[PDB]
Design an enzyme around this catalytic site. Structure first.
Site, short mmCIF file in Angstrom:
data_model
loop_
_atom_site.label_atom_id
_atom_site.label_comp_id
_atom_site.label_asym_id
_atom_site.label_seq_id
_atom_site.Cartn_x
_atom_site.Cartn_y
_atom_site.Cartn_z
N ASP A 45 0.84 -1.20 0.00
CA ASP A 45 0.00 0.00 0.00
C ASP A 45 0.87 1.24 0.00
O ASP A 45 1.13 1.82 1.06
CB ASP A 45 -0.97 0.03 1.18
N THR A 78 -4.84 5.78 -3.81
CA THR A 78 -3.53 6.37 -3.56
C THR A 78 -2.45 5.71 -4.40
O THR A 78 -1.82 6.35 -5.24
CB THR A 78 -3.19 6.26 -2.08
N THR A 79 -2.22 4.41 -4.17
CA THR A 79 -1.33 3.66 -5.04
C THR A 79 -1.75 3.79 -6.50
O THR A 79 -0.90 3.83 -7.39
CB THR A 79 -1.30 2.19 -4.61
N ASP A 382 -13.31 -5.93 6.62
CA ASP A 382 -13.52 -5.82 5.18
C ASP A 382 -14.95 -5.44 4.86
O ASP A 382 -15.21 -4.35 4.34
CB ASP A 382 -13.17 -7.13 4.49
#
Lengths: 521, 509
Positions: A45, A78-79, A382
């Site tokens: 991440d 983001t990534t 999750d």
């Protein structure tokens, strides 16, 4: 400098994106990062790791900030926005290398960023519930590490996610919403795994009382104590007289009796079931039990405060006032519709069933394995996050990866009419799109082209939708990588995140595309 | 910023270059590595944990390699040398191929599926033990101390540990852990012989007690563990300004002394002749216990008091008003401070706590004890592995070549790509018997094929090659054995870093 820096900015974008690709998503892999010198950390991440990463460029710098910008919004994309920016810069720099102005390009890119979102705007699904988001059960079922949860793979997931979707949970004094706002949903391995059940009430990891405490009290007001009763150490508070050696200790007995009084005074105003975050002494509980009130002490605060905030009125876990004990005004009433200490998970725990004025349910999943309690924990987290985005946004696009193939085409369509250079400025903007299945397929060790191409061959016109997977796109997979529908494996995206990730990479790249110099003396 | 195949090969190169002589070090037949120093200090050791620290680490994977060896060294401490063995192998054998054949994951996924196959195969070839029979354990423990290669003193350390470990055997999470080692408490005593060393109920505290600590011999009378909430109150129920001056001495001690009285008179009711004050210990507190007509004991470690909570087996209570035998110092209790050698030693006996004896160790010297002491610390790790896993599994090639054919057949029954990892993994097993044949001095590929024939027919049930004798052997008959657990565990650990280093494609800053 110039192109060289705009290559170096690309080389800044290149070197970076190379990593966060391999770190992208669950298929994204953990990566050794040297934190200082002898400090090396294995993570993924990029937005997480880029912060431990020390950039070699302001170009790489601002991009970490951009993902960090994106991160402050959401750690998702983001990534990606980074990986997207690399794609972008590598797309147009060629044109910028070629005949094309750095100004002339980003027009047909940004304006296509308007176009792509205008599809991502015209692409939604308001019902992300039954077909779920990345299905319904499959969000947890994927995140299930399947041991005793796998046979319950739908059972638990259909249990937990439908619990995660909406079940009865009183928020602070019960604001109604979906209960991912708080989960007193829990897990305790005991009994068997199928026997894992949602509970109607409040789950409590607790010290259930003793001493003649009623082990169940139906319809009881609550004292939820942030406090710890103990006794207030006093040699003389009452009855100073010295008559028998009985009396001298009966002097210091009065720390207990004023409690005994105010316990019963708390009984008298009201409660039959008492929840104490800390310990109460053996007489304190006894005072409740001789008051006939069930005293559950040393109650787990997270549950208890969630109860205490939901327990009604203003309660000793919502109260800082402690007199050594404090008679209620019946604005100190906690509330339990009915109170039960019930064996659950081979464990007798107090289960506050809802609230005397208000309603809640929880879960304690019965396992044979703490490892079960280790995993659906995540699967909750999750699905909680999955369905949280479902819950605050019923607006979500079908598919996370099916958009790309359509979008390029959708842009390819939007491209061809634009003409001039900016027909292509749309196309290279559509070429930045294509890494999304790729790094996925790459991190999944899948062939990216034979998917995204096959993806681009799902269409009549361009839409993401299960009705036509043949004549339109829908959904996605991760490990295989291929498109799914909705409730198939079918991926989604909350329509909020991408457009932002879209917006950012488009804007960071152009300001990266801005400068031709970096000078110093 | 290093990454990819080069790292993926460098990971092997890092990890694999270690184990080379380290595998020869495996087994009592062992080839010590010479470690010279830049200083010039020479080191001959077969033990990686020493080898790992002392060596320049050329790669961060080696840094990571240290972790899981320290892990098992922390996890058990048995087979620490063996955890880095098959981690490189998995990587070493297949990796370059299957990433050239393009995937981290197919191997990564084939780590687990090979893993449980052994575990499944183990529990068949791992056959239960008599813990009822200490010798059914002891023979392994004897096989374990001859693995530690001291049968002289440590054969007694066998019994002492065993007898202790059977007693330090207990625990309840509701899943009821079998042993508890953090209960097990040895002693370190000069004087007496380790044959005269023994184990008695509860936790013997020599740890804070090398001298007078709690009287000498407190027979029935209690020791009082204090988690109160004993702090002498400057006022009565309130804390006020501290004492800088005479008035503060007068007025405040007035309010202070009666509170410890309010406290340690609630202590005198539980029948201590001694009160060990871990919390609330302060100039006034222990001063009043002699005024409470009970010995007071000052500023003590709660580790003991928690050991002591396993010694007399009580809990410890912070209750200022309620202080009792059941609250602290359960059972009748036996508090005995004995001078064994020159040092006075509190022995807390009459344990009220399940089983739970802890270890007297008195050697004629500290040193003559130490040879027992370490292997007894090893035997307890061994005993508990027999306890945690009561299936004794034959050591070496018997447990080795067995799983391989399963894995191959597994791989063959799967006949996918992951077959190759299993084919790598099943072949990754064969190193240690090869290494043992490497170690013994015979020709391995013969003995390997020979051991294959041991599996081709027997399934290598009890049949490995025995590195000591270097021959195909009956490990049942040899008594060569080991618990499934450490066998599993050390192996299951050896899987993990291979999962790691294959997962990790980017080494950056």
């Amino acid at each position: 400098t110039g192109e060289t820096i705009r290559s170096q900015n690309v080389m800044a974008a290149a070197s970076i994106a190379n990593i966060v690709k391999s770190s992208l998503g669950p298929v994204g892999l953990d990566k050794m990062l040297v934190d200082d010198i002898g400090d090396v950390t294995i993570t993924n991440d990029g937005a997480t790791i880029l912060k431990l990463l020390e950039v070699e460029h302001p170009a790489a710098k601002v991009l970490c900030e951009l993902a960090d910008l994106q991160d402050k919004e959401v750690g998702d994309g983001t990534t990606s926005v980074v990986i997207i920016a690399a794609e972008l810069l590598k797309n147009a720099d060629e044109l910028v290398k070629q005949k094309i102005h750095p100004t002339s390009v980003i027009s047909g890119y940004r304006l296509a960023c308007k176009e792509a979102v205008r599809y991502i705007n015209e692409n939604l699904i308001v019902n992300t519930d039954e077909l779920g988001r990345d299905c319904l059960i499959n969000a947890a079922k994927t995140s299930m590490s399947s041991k005793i949860i796998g046979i319950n793979g739908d059972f638990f997931a259909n249990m937990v996610v439908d619990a995660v979707l909406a079940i009865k949970y009183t928020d602070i004094r019960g604001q109604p919403r979906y209960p991912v706002n708080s989960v007193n949903i829990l897990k305790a391995h005991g009994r068997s795994q199928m026997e894992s059940m949602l509970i109607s009430g409040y789950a409590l990891n607790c010290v259930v009382g003793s001493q003649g405490m009623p082990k169940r009290i139906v319809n009881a007001k609550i004292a939820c104590l942030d406090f710890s009763l103990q006794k207030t150490k006093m040699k003389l508070g009452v009855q100073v007289v010295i008559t028998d050696p009985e009396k001298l200790d009966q002097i210091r007995q009065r720390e207990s009796d004023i409690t005994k009084e105010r316990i019963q005074k708390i009984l008298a105003t009201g409660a039959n079931v008492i929840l104490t975050t800390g310990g109460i002494d053996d007489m304190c509980l006894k005072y409740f039990v001789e008051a006939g009130a069930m005293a559950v002490r040393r109650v787990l605060k997270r549950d208890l405060k969630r109860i205490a905030k939901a327990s009604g009125a203003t309660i000793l876990s919502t109260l800082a006032n402690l007199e050594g004990e404090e008679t209620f005004e019946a604005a100190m009433l906690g509330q339990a519709e009915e109170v039960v200490q019930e064996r659950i998970c081979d464990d007798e725990l107090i289960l506050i069933k809802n609230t005397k004025a208000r309603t809640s349910a929880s879960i304690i999943l019965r396992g044979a394995n703490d490892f079960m309690c280790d995993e659906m924990e995540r699967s909750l987290h999750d699905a909680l996050c999955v369905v949280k985005r479902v819950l605050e946004s019923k607006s979500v696009v079908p598919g996370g990866g099916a958009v790309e193939a359509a979008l390029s085409i959708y842009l390819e369509n939007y491209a061809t009419s634009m003409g001039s250079r900016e027909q292509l400025a749309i196309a290279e903007f559509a070429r930045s799109l294509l890494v999304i299945p790729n790094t996925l397929a790459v991190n999944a060790a899948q062939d990216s082209t034979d998917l995204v191409a096959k993806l681009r061959a799902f269409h009549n016109e361009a839409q993401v939708n299960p009705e036509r997977k043949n004549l339109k796109w829908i959904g996605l997979d991760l490990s295989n990588g291929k498109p799914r529908d909705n409730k198939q494996a079918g991926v989604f995206e909350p329509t909020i995140v991408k457009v932002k990730s879209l917006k950012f990479a488009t804007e960071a790249a152009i300001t990266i595309l801005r400068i031709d110099d970096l000078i110093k003396l | 910023r290093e990454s990819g195949r080069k790292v993926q090969s460098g990971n092997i190169n890092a990890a694999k270059t270690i184990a080379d002589i380290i595998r020869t070090c495996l087994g009592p037949k062992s080839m010590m590595k010479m470690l010279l120093d830049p200083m010039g200090g020479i080191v001959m050791t077969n033990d990686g944990n020493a080898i790992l620290r002392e060596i320049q680490v050329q790669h961060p994977a080696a840094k990571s390699m240290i972790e899981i060896s320290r892990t098992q060294d922390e996890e058990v401490g048995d087979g620490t040398t063996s955890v880095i063995i098959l981690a490189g192998e998995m990587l070493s054998v297949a990796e370059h191929f299957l990433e050239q054949q393009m995937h981290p994951t197919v191997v990564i996924s084939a780590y687990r599926k090979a893993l449980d196959d052994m575990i499944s195969t183990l529990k068949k070839i791992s056959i239960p033990v008599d813990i009822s029979d200490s010798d059914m354990m002891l023979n392994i423990i004897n096989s374990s101390i001859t693995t530690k290669a001291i049968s002289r003193w440590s054969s007694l350390a066998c019994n002492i540990a065993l007898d202790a470990v059977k007693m330090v055997q207990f625990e309840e999470n509701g899943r009821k852990e079998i042993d508890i080692k953090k209960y097990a408490r040895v002693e370190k005593i000069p004087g007496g012989i380790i044959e005269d060393s023994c184990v008695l109920r509860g936790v013997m505290i020599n740890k804070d007690v090398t001298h007078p600590r709690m009287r000498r011999y407190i027979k029935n009378p209690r020791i009082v563990l204090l988690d109160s909430s004993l702090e002498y109150k400057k006022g009565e129920s309130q804390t006020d300004i501290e004492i800088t001056r005479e008035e503060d001495f007068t007025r405040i001690l007035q309010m202070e002394e009666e509170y410890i009285q309010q406290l340690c008179e609630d202590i005198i009711q539980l029948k201590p002749d001694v009160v060990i004050t871990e919390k609330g210990i302060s100039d006034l507190a222990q001063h009043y216990l002699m005024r409470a007509n009970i010995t007071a004991i000052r500023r003590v470690r709660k580790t003991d008091n928690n050991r002591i909570a396993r010694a007399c087996g009580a809990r410890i209570v912070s209750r200022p008003e309620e202080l009792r035998e059941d609250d602290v110092g359960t059972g009748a209790g036996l508090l005995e401070i004995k001078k064994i050698g020159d040092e006075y030693f509190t022995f807390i006996t009459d344990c009220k706590d399940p089983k739970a004896c802890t270890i007297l160790l008195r050697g004629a010297s500290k040193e003559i004890l130490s040879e027992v002491e370490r292997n007894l610390q090893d035997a307890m790790q061994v005993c508990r592995n027999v306890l945690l896993d009561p299936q004794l599994v034959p050591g070496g090639g018997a447990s080795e070549m067995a799983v391989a054919h399963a894995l191959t057949e597994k791989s063959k029954a799967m006949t996918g790509v992951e077959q190759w990892p299993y084919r790598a993994v099943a072949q990754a097993l064969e190193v240690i018997p090869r290494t043992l044949i490497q170690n013994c001095g015979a020709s391995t590929i013969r003995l390997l094929t020979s051991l294959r024939a041991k599996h081709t027919q027997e399934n290598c049930e009890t049949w490995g090659v025995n590195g000591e004798t270097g021959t195909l052997v009956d490990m049942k008959e040899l008594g060569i054995w080991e618990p499934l657990a450490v066998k599993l565990q050390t192996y299951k650990t050896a899987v993990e870093t291979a999962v790691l280093l294959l997962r990790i494609d980017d080494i950056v800053s």
